[PDB]
């Protein structure tokens, strides 16, 4: 699951069977780390006009 963005500790209360979350844009906004099994939030890096 490749991509670019800022990773932080998540406050999302994932259940044991859930590996990631999705938005309405069909993008991943949270993942479970395969080694530590902690949940990370994913956000885009800053941009603007």
């Amino acid at each position: 699951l490749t991509g670019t963005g800022v990773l932080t500790e998540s406050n999302k209360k994932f259940l044991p069977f859930q590996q990631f979350g999705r938005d309405i844009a069909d993008t991943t906004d949270a993942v479970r780390d395969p080694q530590t099994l902690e949940i990370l939030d994913i956000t885009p890096c800053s941009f603007g006009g």
Binding site: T2, G3, I24, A25
Partner: protein, 97 residues
């Protein structure tokens, strides 16, 4: 009269709701495949080689470009209606107030 009727100001709420719906539609269209193997561009690039990936990508570009063009056209039409309303309000200010 106003406080006892939650829908009294519907004329302004309708404008807010229409704008919100237009944006939500524009975003949701990103989930469409448009004939591509996937709506997710990164998955296409990660799985397929260039001469094949480009074929799938062009399908997403066509669909997304068409969706964005549709959005703008609708905004131009809606803007014209709002301008007419503002022109009327400006006239009433001058002549009634």
């Amino acid at each position: 009269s106003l406080s006892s009727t939650p829908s009294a100001l519907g004329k302004l709420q309708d404008v807010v709701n229409q704008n919100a719906q237009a944006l939500n539609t524009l975003v949701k269209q990103l989930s469409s495949n448009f004939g591509a193997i996937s709506s997710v561009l990164n998955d296409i690039l990660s799985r397929l080689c260039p001469p094949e990936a480009e074929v799938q990508i062009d399908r997403l570009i066509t669909g997304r470009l068409q969706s964005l063009q549709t959005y703008v056209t609708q905004q131009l039409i809606r803007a014209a209606e709002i301008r007419a309303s503002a022109n009327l309000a400006a006239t009433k200010m001058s002549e009634c107030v």
